[PDB]
Amino acid sequence: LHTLKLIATTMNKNIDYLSPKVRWKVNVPWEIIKEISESVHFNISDYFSDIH
Amino acid sequence: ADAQRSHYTVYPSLPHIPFVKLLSGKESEVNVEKRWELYHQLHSHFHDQVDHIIDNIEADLKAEISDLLYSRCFNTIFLLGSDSTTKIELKDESSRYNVLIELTPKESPNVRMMLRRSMYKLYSAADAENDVSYDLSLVENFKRLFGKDLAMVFNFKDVDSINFNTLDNFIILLKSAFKYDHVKISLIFNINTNLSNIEKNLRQSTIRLLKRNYHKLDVSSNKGFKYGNQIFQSFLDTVDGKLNLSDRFVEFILSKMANNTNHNLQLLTKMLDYSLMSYFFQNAFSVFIDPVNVDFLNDDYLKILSRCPTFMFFVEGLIKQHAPADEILSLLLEEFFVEFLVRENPINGHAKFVARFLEEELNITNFNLIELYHNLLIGKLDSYLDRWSACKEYKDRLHFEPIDTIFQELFTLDNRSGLLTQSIFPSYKSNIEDNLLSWEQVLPSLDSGDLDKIMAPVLGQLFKLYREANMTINIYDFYIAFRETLPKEEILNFIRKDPSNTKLLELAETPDAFDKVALILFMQAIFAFENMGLIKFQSTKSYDLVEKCVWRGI
Amino acid sequence: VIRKFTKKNVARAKKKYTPFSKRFKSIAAIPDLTSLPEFYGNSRFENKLKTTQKHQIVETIFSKVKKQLNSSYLPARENEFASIYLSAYSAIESDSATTIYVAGTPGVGKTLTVREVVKELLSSSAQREIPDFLYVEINGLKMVKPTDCYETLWNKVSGERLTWAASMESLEFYFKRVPKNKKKTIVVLLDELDAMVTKSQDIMYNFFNWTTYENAKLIVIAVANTMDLPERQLGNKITSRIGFTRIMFTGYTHEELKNIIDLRLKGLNDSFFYVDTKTGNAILIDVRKVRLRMSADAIEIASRKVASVSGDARRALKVCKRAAEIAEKHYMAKHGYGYDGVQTVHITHVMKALNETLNSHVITFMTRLSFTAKLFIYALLNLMKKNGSQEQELGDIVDEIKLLIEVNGSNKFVMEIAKTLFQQGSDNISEQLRIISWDFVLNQLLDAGILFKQTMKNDRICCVKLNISVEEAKRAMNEDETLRNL
DNA sequence: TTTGAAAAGCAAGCATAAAAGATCTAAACATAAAATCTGTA
DNA sequence: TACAGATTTTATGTTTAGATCTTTTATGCTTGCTTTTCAAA
Ligand SMILES: Nc1ncnc2c1ncn2[C@@H]1O[C@H](COP(=O)(O)OP(=O)(O)OP(=O)(O)O)[C@@H](O)[C@H]1O
Numbered sequence A: 001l002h003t004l005k006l007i008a009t010t011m012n013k014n015i016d017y018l019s020p021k022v023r024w025k026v027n028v029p030w031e032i033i034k035e036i037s038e039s040v041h042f043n044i045s046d047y048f049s050d051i052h
Numbered sequence B: 001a002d003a004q005r006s007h008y009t010v011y012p013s014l015p016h017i018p019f020v021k022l023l024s025g026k027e028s029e030v031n032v033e034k035r036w037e038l039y040h041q042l043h044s045h046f047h048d049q050v051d052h053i054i055d056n057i058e059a060d061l062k063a064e065i066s067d068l069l070y071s072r073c074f075n076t077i078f079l080l081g082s083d084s085t086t087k088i089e090l091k092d093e094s095s096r097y098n099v100l101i102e103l104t105p106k107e108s109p110n111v112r113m114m115l116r117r118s119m120y121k122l123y124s125a126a127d128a129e130n131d132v133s134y135d136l137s138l139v140e141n142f143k144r145l146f147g148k149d150l151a152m153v154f155n156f157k158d159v160d161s162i163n164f165n166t167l168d169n170f171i172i173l174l175k176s177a178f179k180y181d182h183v184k185i186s187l188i189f190n191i192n193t194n195l196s197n198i199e200k201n202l203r204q205s206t207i208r209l210l211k212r213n214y215h216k217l218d219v220s221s222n223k224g225f226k227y228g229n230q231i232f233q234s235f236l237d238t239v240d241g242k243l244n245l246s247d248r249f250v251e252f253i254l255s256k257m258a259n260n261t262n263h264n265l266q267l268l269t270k271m272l273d274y275s276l277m278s279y280f281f282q283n284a285f286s287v288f289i290d291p292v293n294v295d296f297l298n299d300d301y302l303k304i305l306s307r308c309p310t311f312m313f314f315v316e317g318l319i320k321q322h323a324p325a326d327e328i329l330s331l332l333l334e335e336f337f338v339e340f341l342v343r344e345n346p347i348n349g350h351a352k353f354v355a356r357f358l359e360e361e362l363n364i365t366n367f368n369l370i371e372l373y374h375n376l377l378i379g380k381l382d383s384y385l386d387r388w389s390a391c392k393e394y395k396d397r398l399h400f401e402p403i404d405t406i407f408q409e410l411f412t413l414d415n416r417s418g419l420l421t422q423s424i425f426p427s428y429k430s431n432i433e434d435n436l437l438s439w440e441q442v443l444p445s446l447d448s449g450d451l452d453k454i455m456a457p458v459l460g461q462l463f464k465l466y467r468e469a470n471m472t473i474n475i476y477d478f479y480i481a482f483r484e485t486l487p488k489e490e491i492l493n494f495i496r497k498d499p500s501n502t503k504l505l506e507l508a509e510t511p512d513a514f515d516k517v518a519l520i521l522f523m524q525a526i527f528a529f530e531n532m533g534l535i536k537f538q539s540t541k542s543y544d545l546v547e548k549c550v551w552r553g554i
Numbered sequence C: 001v002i003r004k005f006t007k008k009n010v011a012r013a014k015k016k017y018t019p020f021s022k023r024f025k026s027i028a029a030i031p032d033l034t035s036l037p038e039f040y041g042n043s044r045f046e047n048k049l050k051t052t053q054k055h056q057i058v059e060t061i062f063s064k065v066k067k068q069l070n071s072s073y074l075p076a077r078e079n080e081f082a083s084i085y086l087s088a089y090s091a092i093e094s095d096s097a098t099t100i101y102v103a104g105t106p107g108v109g110k111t112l113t114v115r116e117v118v119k120e121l122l123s124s125s126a127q128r129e130i131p132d133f134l135y136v137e138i139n140g141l142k143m144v145k146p147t148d149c150y151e152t153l154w155n156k157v158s159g160e161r162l163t164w165a166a167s168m169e170s171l172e173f174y175f176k177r178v179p180k181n182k183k184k185t186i187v188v189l190l191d192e193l194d195a196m197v198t199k200s201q202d203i204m205y206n207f208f209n210w211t212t213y214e215n216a217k218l219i220v221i222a223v224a225n226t227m228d229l230p231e232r233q234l235g236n237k238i239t240s241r242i243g244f245t246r247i248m249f250t251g252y253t254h255e256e257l258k259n260i261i262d263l264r265l266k267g268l269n270d271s272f273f274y275v276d277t278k279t280g281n282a283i284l285i286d287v288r289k290v291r292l293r294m295s296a297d298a299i300e301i302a303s304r305k306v307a308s309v310s311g312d313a314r315r316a317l318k319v320c321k322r323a324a325e326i327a328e329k330h331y332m333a334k335h336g337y338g339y340d341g342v343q344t345v346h347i348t349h350v351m352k353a354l355n356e357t358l359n360s361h362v363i364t365f366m367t368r369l370s371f372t373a374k375l376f377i378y379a380l381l382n383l384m385k386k387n388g389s390q391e392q393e394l395g396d397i398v399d400e401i402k403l404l405i406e407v408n409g410s411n412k413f414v415m416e417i418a419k420t421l422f423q424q425g426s427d428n429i430s431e432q433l434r435i436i437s438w439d440f441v442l443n444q445l446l447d448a449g450i451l452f453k454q455t456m457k458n459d460r461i462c463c464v465k466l467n468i469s470v471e472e473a474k475r476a477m478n479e480d481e482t483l484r485n486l
Numbered sequence D: 001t002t003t004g005a006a007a008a009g010c011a012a013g014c015a016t017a018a019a020a021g022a023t024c025t026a027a028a029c030a031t032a033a034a035a036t037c038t039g040t041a
Numbered sequence E: 001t002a003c004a005g006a007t008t009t010t011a012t013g014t015t016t017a018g019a020t021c022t023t024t025t026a027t028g029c030t031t032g033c034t035t036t037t038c039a040a041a
């Protein structure tokens, strides 16, 4: 998932994967993750309905 | 010192097969060599078919790309699930240079490098069959220099990895070649994720440009299961009449094959290979898959084969059906073992029969032969065939009940010991956590014997206090907690055991001796934890607090 | 072969690669280098720049004063002359090797007195009081590459042309292993030594290290602009190991500059000239006899102003030349003379020539700008008066300009000019977000150096600062009769 | 069935880590003319 | 020695991999007040 850049890091070249200073973030929009969650029948909207 | 070097070569000092002697070492070396050679013919018979299948994948896939590539805009091909390993061929088409250009994201940091590498490769390929500038005026002057027309086929490898702004600007750059009447351009995109992820990163005018003629091609090995079924059938015809496959093994194959999508066939080959190595390394009955070794029966073979549960069930059924006791004691065998290892086991041929009947007689192609074989093993083939709504009239022809044959447990591929899990797909960090927490399943408890008996090894003792602590640990309080577990008297007796070391004896009579020893061991274990990745110093120049990073059971 | 790039304009000099360590078989196989016609120097481009004139030049009485105050044409440098001359003379007569480091600010007579010491040494060697020597002058600011000094000095020593690394090994082998009886003494002037040491300290350390050799017979005079150049380019251990002579050159006082100027003008002041009354040509002694003078207080205040600021002879000589040029310009304009009783260079001419140096044109340039540019500067000054940041966003300047136009609606000038500023006086042009000539005056103030603008492609949040000061801007906008009342 | 009270939540302010990149250096990769070294002749 | 040819030397251009420092923004700590579920009467 990192080499496909659906997940991203804070640094892009010479990445230290095993350092605790390097953090991770998602790299897909809401529509992509929505159709991914409906592909597996996961209720991803239920974790966002009560928060806002 | 070589230990402090970056790298060094050792020319070892030389002062013959890795198979060992089974039957508690009482197996003959002839049987060991015969097991070795038997494993080699089975492995060769499987892997020749696997190599032929992989070559056929390459040939048919080049054929499909060559068909789609031929017969004022780009000609766009999207290869979905490509992994970009295939060598794309272009034909010989007279009065026209067909030049193929591979570009990777490493060769593409900006549009300038893309154009310079592309025109260098174009000029080199045109010269291979006066220096020039490596820019797009080489394209417009191509018929003036070389005399023939130009057909460029761009192959972008790992499109999910190239920066999309650079790729968009490169496509817009290549649009400028449409005003030359001697140039046609084809683009091949190796898409790994999906097409909707690609068009959300490209600009809308570029998508409108690419929409004029584009062709999608699912180039994955998962599509139709056509290549996995050939590999699994090749393994079945290797072991047909010799070895059986358990339902646990095939279910394990399916479960592991689901978890990897881009690289499925060689994972299947690796799993089947390791199961074959494990069987031929652990089982002394492997020589009996060849009928010429039936004179090699010894005592230890008989007491190993007498513990088979099929033999157990057969003899208790025999005492159920036969009232006299004289015939029962005669069997409790060497001649009865031989007559049943030559059975045909027609489940493999019937699996081939339903495979060819589903493929070539009902025009149904979306079936997994591994899943079909699992359903035939568990006895639910009808519950696998009642999905396509066309095997209803053929439900009674394809019926098969499983025959639990006698002494099949000595010739089968299973996983009830977890060896395939521990070797190919281990729970790596869970194994590290469980070896740290328990540690009596690693180090033996032999019965400095006293200090070894009543004090833990330092890393496990540190991990026991690490696991029960909070996210943020004070280092001094951690050292105070670690010092309480240690024996204050037996450690001081332990460092006085050797009278030759004088400085340690001098340090032992210090009134601050035990705290120094505890702090030294604590600091060494703390830096071992820091190197393993278990803790992290949340600072640069204090080193007073640490943060927990790893939790057991996650 | 298909190339990945081409280098089509490579011009390579025909310089050999073999150093002097391989010219002979052994150290005892080296002949007398003094008795060789290529060693130690044992200009054909003048006739390119030659032509014949048709008309005679009219040499005006002030042109003698101008020509005789040039830097191309040693009062006050006697202790420095004595120090350099005795160090070099004592090292030449003892066949030793030494180095003299001379430092100072530009124009204080460093190169001039080093050259005068060298010519006095050459004259003493012509009288056979000291043995003969070669003179090499190496200027660090007259090079393409700093290593070319290695190419130059060896070419002055041996007569052959080598590459710089081979020249460096050749000079090392020459100063180390060649015996003293087979070589000549060398005096090197290393002028502008900070130009040759910027990349690294190899040339400095090599030239200072060669003077520590017992066989070298080398005199290195190194001239620089800072004093701590050897102390910061080499360590204190190295500079203690060489032990160079250390000489500073302080700037001239006003009395020394005055003696320099009237020694340039010794034969011309209070002197008679035969002047052709129809052309203006003057001959030093239909023809008028004119005396020529420069007053003492003019030279006095010129040398007093120069010695306060810089203290160098070039500035004092040049303001005297500029005063003479101003006087000759007024003289030629008055008499109607061409190019082909008492004439004096007055105190006011020296005043005006000094005022061209002293004054700045920033305020004068800003008072002659257009209304839009002065509006920009006024809005900028208002913004740094309000928020006090010294960097203002361009959108804030736009809004402040719009607010200053909208507030002063009762003013006659703003009411007359607003249609010009926002529509270019035309009813077919829509009302613009910027004033007319907005980017024109922004680019003009950036080109003049009045402003500084950061590099940012958002034109609104991009920041701009005054690059001069706030007081010249305040003096400029208070001059304008429009801006100063609103 | 209450109850109360300590755990959890929240926010203003602030010191500090860290992201993003501007700027630069050096190594790998690449070419090229003059000099210099090799192998025959 | 002579000389064509191969290799070195010196000199410079092209591209990539990585280091350091600056500027702006995220992030965690502290302290004081407010809500909320669970251990106990
Ligand atoms: N003592 C002097 N007597 C007469 N003329 C002098 C004297 N000093 C300097 N000058 C004049 O000023 C010019 C500048 O002197 P010079 O070139 O020696 O300066 P410098 O200290 O080497 O300067 P820089 O550091 O700029 O090279 C000389 O060429 C000469 O015309």
Ligand SMILES: [Mg+2]
Binding pocket: C110, C111, C112, C191
């Ligand atoms: Mg000078």
